[PDB]
Coordinates of C-alpha atoms and ligand atoms in Angstrom, one line a residue:
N15 CA -8.4 11.8 0.1
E16 CA -5.0 11.5 1.8
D17 CA -6.8 10.6 5.1
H18 CA -8.9 7.9 3.3
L19 CA -5.7 6.4 1.7
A20 CA -3.9 6.4 5.1
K21 CA -7.0 4.7 6.6
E22 CA -6.9 1.9 3.9
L23 CA -3.1 1.6 4.4
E24 CA -3.8 0.7 8.2
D25 CA -4.4 -2.8 6.7
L26 CA -1.1 -2.9 4.8
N27 CA 0.1 -5.9 6.7
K28 CA -3.3 -7.7 6.7
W29 CA -5.0 -10.2 4.4
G30 CA -7.9 -8.4 2.7
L31 CA -6.6 -4.9 2.6
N32 CA -9.1 -3.2 0.2
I33 CA -6.9 -2.7 -2.9
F34 CA -9.9 -1.5 -4.9
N35 CA -10.2 1.4 -2.5
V36 CA -6.4 2.0 -2.7
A37 CA -6.7 2.3 -6.5
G38 CA -9.5 4.8 -6.0
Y39 CA -7.7 7.0 -3.6
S40 CA -4.4 6.9 -5.4
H41 CA -5.9 8.0 -8.8
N42 CA -5.6 4.6 -10.3
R43 CA -2.0 3.9 -9.3
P44 CA -2.5 1.0 -6.9
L45 CA 0.7 -0.8 -7.8
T46 CA 3.0 2.3 -7.4
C47 CA 1.1 3.3 -4.2
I48 CA 1.1 -0.2 -2.6
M49 CA 4.7 -1.0 -3.6
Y50 CA 6.0 2.4 -2.1
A51 CA 4.0 1.6 1.1
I52 CA 5.4 -2.0 1.3
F53 CA 9.0 -0.9 0.6
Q54 CA 8.7 1.9 3.3
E55 CA 7.1 -0.5 5.8
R56 CA 9.9 -3.2 5.4
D57 CA 12.7 -0.5 5.3
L58 CA 13.7 -2.0 1.9
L59 CA 14.6 1.3 0.4
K60 CA 17.0 1.9 3.3
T61 CA 18.3 -1.8 3.4
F62 CA 19.0 -2.0 -0.4
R63 CA 19.9 1.7 -0.7
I64 CA 17.2 2.5 -3.3
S65 CA 16.4 6.2 -3.7
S66 CA 12.7 7.1 -3.6
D67 CA 13.2 8.7 -7.0
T68 CA 14.6 5.6 -8.6
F69 CA 11.9 3.4 -7.0
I70 CA 8.9 5.5 -7.9
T71 CA 10.3 6.0 -11.5
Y72 CA 10.6 2.2 -11.9
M73 CA 7.2 1.6 -10.3
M74 CA 5.4 4.1 -12.4
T75 CA 7.0 2.7 -15.6
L76 CA 6.2 -0.9 -14.5
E77 CA 2.6 0.1 -13.8
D78 CA 2.3 1.9 -17.2
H79 CA 3.2 -1.5 -18.8
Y80 CA 0.2 -3.2 -17.3
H81 CA -2.6 -2.8 -19.8
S82 CA -5.5 -0.7 -18.3
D83 CA -7.9 -2.1 -20.9
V84 CA -7.6 -5.7 -19.8
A85 CA -10.3 -6.5 -17.2
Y86 CA -8.3 -8.6 -14.8
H87 CA -4.5 -8.7 -15.6
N88 CA -4.0 -4.9 -15.1
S89 CA -2.0 -3.2 -12.3
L90 CA -4.7 -3.7 -9.7
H91 CA -4.2 -7.4 -9.8
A92 CA -0.4 -6.9 -9.6
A93 CA -0.9 -4.6 -6.6
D94 CA -3.1 -7.2 -5.0
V95 CA -0.6 -10.1 -5.5
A96 CA 2.3 -7.9 -4.2
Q97 CA 0.4 -6.9 -1.0
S98 CA -0.8 -10.5 -0.5
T99 CA 2.9 -11.7 -0.9
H100 CA 3.9 -9.1 1.6
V101 CA 1.4 -10.6 4.1
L102 CA 2.5 -14.2 3.4
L103 CA 6.2 -13.3 4.1
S104 CA 5.3 -12.2 7.6
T105 CA 3.2 -15.3 8.6
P106 CA 4.5 -16.2 12.1
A107 CA 5.4 -19.7 11.2
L108 CA 8.1 -18.2 8.8
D109 CA 9.6 -15.9 11.5
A110 CA 13.3 -15.2 10.6
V111 CA 13.2 -17.9 7.9
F112 CA 13.8 -15.7 4.8
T113 CA 16.6 -13.3 4.2
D114 CA 16.2 -9.7 3.2
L115 CA 17.2 -10.6 -0.4
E116 CA 14.5 -13.3 -0.5
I117 CA 11.9 -10.8 0.9
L118 CA 12.9 -8.2 -1.8
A119 CA 12.9 -10.8 -4.6
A120 CA 9.5 -12.2 -3.6
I121 CA 7.7 -8.8 -3.4
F122 CA 9.4 -7.7 -6.7
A123 CA 8.4 -10.9 -8.4
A124 CA 4.8 -10.4 -7.3
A125 CA 4.8 -6.9 -8.7
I126 CA 6.1 -7.8 -12.1
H127 CA 4.6 -11.2 -12.5
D128 CA 1.9 -10.3 -15.0
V129 CA 3.4 -7.2 -16.6
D130 CA 2.4 -6.6 -20.2
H131 CA -0.3 -9.3 -20.1
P132 CA -2.3 -9.3 -23.3
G133 CA -5.5 -10.6 -21.6
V134 CA -5.4 -14.0 -23.2
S135 CA -4.1 -17.3 -22.0
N136 CA -0.9 -19.4 -22.8
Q137 CA -3.1 -21.9 -24.6
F138 CA -4.5 -19.1 -26.8
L139 CA -1.0 -17.8 -27.7
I140 CA 0.2 -21.3 -28.5
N141 CA -2.8 -22.2 -30.7
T142 CA -2.7 -18.9 -32.6
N143 CA 1.1 -19.3 -33.4
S144 CA 1.9 -16.1 -31.5
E145 CA 5.4 -14.6 -31.8
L146 CA 5.7 -15.0 -28.0
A147 CA 4.8 -18.7 -28.2
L148 CA 7.5 -19.0 -31.0
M149 CA 10.1 -17.1 -29.0
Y150 CA 9.6 -19.3 -25.9
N151 CA 8.8 -22.6 -27.6
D152 CA 5.3 -22.8 -26.0
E153 CA 7.0 -23.0 -22.5
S154 CA 5.6 -20.7 -19.8
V155 CA 5.0 -18.3 -22.6
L156 CA 3.3 -15.3 -20.7
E157 CA 5.5 -15.9 -17.7
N158 CA 8.7 -15.6 -19.7
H159 CA 7.3 -12.5 -21.3
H160 CA 6.5 -10.9 -17.9
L161 CA 10.1 -11.6 -16.8
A162 CA 11.5 -10.2 -20.0
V163 CA 9.5 -6.9 -19.6
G164 CA 9.9 -6.5 -15.9
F165 CA 13.7 -7.0 -16.1
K166 CA 14.2 -4.8 -19.2
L167 CA 12.5 -1.9 -17.5
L168 CA 15.3 -1.9 -14.9
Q169 CA 17.6 -0.6 -17.7
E170 CA 15.6 2.5 -18.3
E171 CA 17.0 5.9 -17.1
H172 CA 16.8 6.1 -13.2
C173 CA 15.0 2.7 -13.0
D174 CA 17.6 0.2 -11.7
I175 CA 16.3 -0.3 -8.2
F176 CA 19.0 -3.1 -7.7
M177 CA 22.0 -1.0 -8.5
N178 CA 23.4 -1.1 -4.9
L179 CA 22.9 -4.8 -4.4
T180 CA 26.1 -6.8 -4.4
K181 CA 27.0 -8.7 -7.6
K182 CA 26.1 -12.0 -6.1
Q183 CA 22.9 -10.5 -4.6
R184 CA 21.9 -9.3 -8.1
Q185 CA 22.6 -12.7 -9.6
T186 CA 20.8 -14.6 -6.9
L187 CA 17.8 -12.2 -6.9
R188 CA 17.5 -12.6 -10.7
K189 CA 17.4 -16.4 -10.3
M190 CA 14.9 -16.2 -7.4
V191 CA 12.6 -13.7 -9.3
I192 CA 12.6 -16.0 -12.3
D193 CA 11.7 -19.0 -10.2
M194 CA 8.8 -17.2 -8.5
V195 CA 7.3 -15.7 -11.7
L196 CA 7.6 -19.0 -13.6
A197 CA 5.9 -20.6 -10.6
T198 CA 2.8 -18.7 -11.6
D199 CA 2.5 -20.7 -14.8
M200 CA -0.5 -23.0 -14.2
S201 CA 1.3 -25.8 -16.1
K202 CA 3.6 -26.0 -13.0
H203 CA 0.9 -26.2 -10.5
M204 CA 0.7 -29.9 -9.9
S205 CA 4.6 -30.1 -9.6
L206 CA 4.7 -27.3 -7.2
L207 CA 1.9 -28.8 -5.1
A208 CA 3.4 -32.1 -5.0
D209 CA 6.7 -30.6 -3.7
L210 CA 4.7 -28.5 -1.1
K211 CA 3.0 -31.8 0.1
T212 CA 6.4 -33.4 0.4
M213 CA 7.6 -30.5 2.5
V214 CA 4.6 -30.8 4.8
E215 CA 5.1 -34.6 5.1
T216 CA 8.8 -34.0 6.1
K217 CA 8.4 -30.6 7.9
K218 CA 10.9 -29.7 10.7
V219 CA 9.7 -27.1 13.3
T220 CA 11.5 -25.3 16.2
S221 CA 10.3 -25.3 19.8
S222 CA 8.6 -21.9 19.0
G223 CA 6.5 -23.4 16.1
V224 CA 8.7 -21.9 13.4
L225 CA 9.5 -23.8 10.1
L226 CA 13.1 -25.0 9.6
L227 CA 14.2 -24.5 6.0
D228 CA 17.8 -25.6 6.0
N229 CA 18.7 -26.0 2.3
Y230 CA 18.2 -23.6 -0.6
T231 CA 15.9 -26.0 -2.5
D232 CA 13.4 -26.1 0.4
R233 CA 13.6 -22.3 0.7
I234 CA 12.9 -21.5 -3.0
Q235 CA 10.2 -24.2 -3.1
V236 CA 8.4 -22.5 -0.3
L237 CA 8.8 -19.1 -2.0
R238 CA 7.6 -20.4 -5.4
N239 CA 4.5 -21.8 -3.7
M240 CA 4.0 -18.6 -1.7
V241 CA 3.8 -16.4 -4.8
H242 CA 1.6 -19.0 -6.6
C243 CA -0.7 -19.0 -3.5
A244 CA -0.8 -15.1 -3.6
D245 CA -1.7 -15.3 -7.3
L246 CA -4.5 -17.8 -6.5
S247 CA -5.6 -15.8 -3.5
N248 CA -8.8 -14.1 -4.8
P249 CA -11.2 -16.9 -3.5
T250 CA -9.6 -16.6 0.0
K251 CA -10.6 -12.9 0.4
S252 CA -13.7 -11.5 2.0
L253 CA -16.7 -12.3 -0.3
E254 CA -17.4 -8.6 -1.3
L255 CA -13.7 -8.5 -2.6
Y256 CA -13.8 -11.9 -4.2
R257 CA -17.0 -11.1 -6.2
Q258 CA -15.2 -8.1 -7.7
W259 CA -12.3 -10.3 -8.8
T260 CA -14.7 -12.9 -10.2
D261 CA -16.4 -10.2 -12.2
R262 CA -13.1 -9.1 -13.7
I263 CA -11.8 -12.6 -14.6
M264 CA -15.1 -13.6 -16.2
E265 CA -15.0 -10.4 -18.3
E266 CA -11.5 -11.3 -19.4
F267 CA -12.4 -15.0 -20.2
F268 CA -15.5 -14.0 -22.2
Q269 CA -13.5 -11.6 -24.2
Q270 CA -10.9 -14.3 -25.0
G271 CA -13.8 -16.7 -25.9
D272 CA -15.2 -14.1 -28.3
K273 CA -11.8 -13.9 -30.0
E274 CA -11.6 -17.8 -30.2
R275 CA -15.2 -17.8 -31.7
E276 CA -14.3 -15.1 -34.3
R277 CA -11.1 -17.0 -35.3
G278 CA -13.3 -20.2 -35.7
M279 CA -11.4 -21.9 -32.8
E280 CA -12.8 -24.1 -30.1
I281 CA -13.8 -21.9 -27.2
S282 CA -11.8 -22.4 -24.1
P283 CA -13.4 -23.8 -20.9
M284 CA -15.4 -21.1 -19.0
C285 CA -15.0 -18.6 -21.9
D286 CA -18.3 -19.0 -23.8
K287 CA -20.6 -16.2 -22.4
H288 CA -23.7 -17.8 -24.0
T289 CA -23.2 -21.0 -21.9
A290 CA -20.7 -20.4 -19.1
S291 CA -21.8 -20.4 -15.4
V292 CA -19.7 -18.0 -13.4
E293 CA -20.6 -19.8 -10.2
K294 CA -19.8 -23.4 -11.5
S295 CA -16.5 -22.1 -12.8
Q296 CA -15.5 -20.7 -9.4
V297 CA -16.5 -23.8 -7.5
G298 CA -14.5 -26.0 -9.9
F299 CA -11.5 -23.7 -9.7
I300 CA -11.6 -23.9 -5.9
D301 CA -12.2 -27.6 -5.7
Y302 CA -9.5 -28.7 -8.2
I303 CA -6.8 -25.9 -7.8
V304 CA -7.2 -23.3 -5.1
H305 CA -8.3 -25.5 -2.1
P306 CA -5.8 -28.3 -2.6
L307 CA -3.0 -25.7 -2.7
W308 CA -4.2 -23.5 0.2
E309 CA -5.1 -26.5 2.5
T310 CA -1.5 -27.8 2.0
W311 CA -0.1 -24.3 2.6
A312 CA -2.3 -24.1 5.7
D313 CA -0.8 -27.3 6.9
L314 CA 2.8 -26.1 6.3
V315 CA 2.2 -22.9 8.4
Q316 CA -0.4 -24.2 10.9
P317 CA -2.3 -22.7 12.5
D318 CA -1.5 -19.3 10.8
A319 CA -3.7 -19.7 7.7
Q320 CA -6.7 -21.0 9.5
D321 CA -8.9 -18.0 8.9
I322 CA -7.8 -17.8 5.2
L323 CA -8.7 -21.4 4.7
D324 CA -12.1 -21.0 6.5
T325 CA -12.9 -18.0 4.3
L326 CA -12.0 -20.0 1.1
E327 CA -14.3 -22.8 2.2
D328 CA -17.1 -20.5 3.1
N329 CA -16.8 -18.6 -0.2
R330 CA -16.8 -21.9 -2.2
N331 CA -20.0 -23.0 -0.5
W332 CA -21.6 -19.6 -1.0
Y333 CA -20.7 -19.7 -4.8
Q334 CA -22.0 -23.3 -5.0
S335 CA -25.4 -22.2 -3.5
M336 CA -25.6 -19.5 -6.2
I337 CA -25.3 -22.1 -9.1
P338 CA -28.2 -21.8 -11.6
Ligands
1S1_1 C1 -3.3 -18.2 -13.6 C2 -4.1 -17.6 -12.6 C3 -5.7 -17.7 -12.8 C4 -6.0 -19.2 -12.7 N1 -6.2 -20.3 -12.7 C5 -6.2 -17.2 -14.2 C6 -5.8 -15.7 -14.4 N2 -6.3 -17.0 -11.7 C7 -7.7 -17.0 -11.4 N3 -8.2 -16.1 -10.6 C8 -9.6 -16.1 -10.4 N4 -10.2 -15.2 -9.5 C9 -11.6 -15.1 -9.3 N5 -10.4 -17.0 -11.0 C10 -9.8 -17.9 -11.8 N6 -10.6 -18.9 -12.5 C11 -10.1 -20.0 -13.0 N7 -11.1 -20.8 -13.4 C12 -12.2 -20.1 -13.0 N8 -11.9 -19.0 -12.4 N9 -8.5 -17.9 -12.1
MG2 MG1 0.1 -14.8 -14.8
ZN3 ZN1 -1.4 -13.2 -11.7

């Protein structure tokens, strides 16, 4: 088992590490397992003076706060987004661009970004007058909640993985994590993409092909988009992995649609299992959301995302060919 897990972790720094296999070989603790691996790999425990005890205590508690009975927004998804963010941070076009604190913040944001997800959408929470929608005035309702839970868990006994950060680093990391988790709210997608396109249109690059990100606004705009890209990365993975993600999201969608139907509500797009095409839903998702984003990211970091973008396009056309 340990040999199988070690073999899978040979792909720790690669797009398309098989996180499903990691879950299997870690007795369904993919988030704790992959986060420990990532933090060891980047020397983050040493740099930020985090004991293994504190880190594994926090991570196990965080993972326990992902719901195992939701089909998609469980800790496997979190583990995938964290590992994908870890890969994106090391894209050669971003060499030496981000600080250690920014790296830490992004990976942490990815790990916590869907914690305590109920397996329904923001629109569902708003339209059912949820306590969470009330608390956050319908504004990034889930994403605010994920932040609330992920941060509060830091206050549990032996859980404050940021204890040895400086005061300013703690404040700045909090702000950055907030920015990156809120950037996973799909209501912010068009704004984020507009800003990414602006950065591409005005990009500055060194002689070595590395992006120049002078001011803090540009830096956080790239990091926000990076975590959003990782969140939206399933269609950019090898087809055998993408198909497993699609199976999981459609299970979660159909379950929400059943709740909507039983409440006498209008069923959300793609959530009616008696009429929904899984394949049409994926092609629309890619055409309207994922491909505009990832093509723009690819342009920002060219040529480093070329195989990722080609895989996305190939998967899109494969799904389109499977439409009934
Ligand atoms: C906020 C992220 C979210 C979005 N959008 C919803 C959880 N991610 C997501 N991931 C997949 N993976 C196959 N598919 C979809 N689909 C969205 N329409 C059809 N599919 N969405
Ligand atoms: Mg989310
Ligand atoms: Zn997510």
